[PDB]
Amino acid sequence: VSKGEAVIKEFMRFKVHMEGSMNGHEFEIEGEGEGRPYEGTQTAKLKVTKGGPLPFSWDILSPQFSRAFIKHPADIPDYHKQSFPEGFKWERVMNFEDGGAVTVTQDTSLEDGTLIYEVKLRGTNFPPDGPVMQKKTMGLEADTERLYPEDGVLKGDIKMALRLKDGGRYLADVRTTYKAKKPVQMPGAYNVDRKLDITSHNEDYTVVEQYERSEGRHSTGMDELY
Ligand code: NA
Ligand code: NA
């Protein structure tokens, strides 16, 4: 626990705005959320404000809507919670098994006690007849982010799996750098286990609600072939 880290309260709200494009199609999202940052739980309500109804799966967007809301055991310091009031940024690459590619950048700030999220997304090389652009996915399976500290940043990697409507999994590798806007006490390497659910949506996905539970843990031990 660091001095000033109690600016992240037991209950916190956020506002989010995304500007994005998928295979050259521009869109925008606006939303709001809330959660229990020390319990690792949160919800959000998102609305499509431009480019709707989206001609692609919501599951591409859902992991882009909140790093203050991760539970930690007592001996893993919270990189993101310590970054306040200044906050942090992140830079992500998603590489899908069929060659779809997504670059995402994000800014997190704090204004009058509310967390402010600005997201920029560019997706390219999605097969037009693939499960993303045909809207044939059915949410994210629970996954694990392996995080390690380097040069005052955190580097994360996720083996991500989207459920397919017709059965089976559609995989991605998701690599992200997380960058505090000031120096903070760094954790060791550790894992974040996560389950993100779409709890409700209107028929055309112009209004979407999501929930996530995120928990930090140690690894038990890595660079093995099998
Ligand atoms: Na998160
Ligand atoms: Na879901």
Residue numbers in the entry: 2 to 66, 71 to 226, 228 to 232
Paper text:
Genetically encoded red fluorescent proteins with a large Stokes shift (LSSRFPs) can be efficiently excited by blue or cyan light while emitting red fluorescence, thus characterized by more than a 100 nm difference between excitation and emission maxima. In this study, we employed rational design and random mutagenesis to convert conventional bright RFP mScarlet into LSSRFP, called LSSmScarlet, characterized by excitation/emission maxima at 470/598 nm. After eight rounds of directed molecular evolution, we selected a final variant mScarlet/T74I/Y84H/K122E/W144L/S147D/F178V/K179R mutant, named LSSmScarlet, characterized by the highest molecular brightness at a 488 nm excitation and the absence of red fluorescence at a 561 nm excitation.
To understand the molecular mechanism of a large Stokes shift in LSSmScarlet and the impact of mutations introduced during directed molecular evolution, we determined its crystal structure using X-ray diffraction at 1.4 Å resolution. There is one protein chain per asymmetric unit, and a contact analysis revealed that the protein is a monomer in the crystal at pH 6.5, i.e., in a highly fluorescent state. LSSmScarlet has a typical β-barrel fold with the mCherry-like chromophore formed by 67MYG69 amino acids and positioned on the central helix of the barrel. The phenolic hydroxyl group of the chromophore forms two hydrogen bonds with the carboxyl group of D147 and with the buried water molecule. The structure revealed that the phenolic hydroxyl group of the chromophore is engaged in direct contact with the carboxyl group of D147 with the donor-acceptor distance of 2.56 Å. Upon excitation of the protonated chromophore in LSSmScarlet, excited-state proton transfer (ESPT) occurs, wherein the phenolic group of the neutral protonated chromophore serves as a donor of a proton to a negatively charged D147 side chain, and the formed anionic chromophore fluoresces. The relative positions of imidazolinone and phenolic rings in the LSSmScarlet and mScarlet chromophores are different. Two rings of the chromophore are almost perfectly in the plane in mScarlet, but phenolic ring is out of the plane in LSSmScarlet with corresponding twist and tilt angles of about 5 and 20° (according to Figure 6 in).
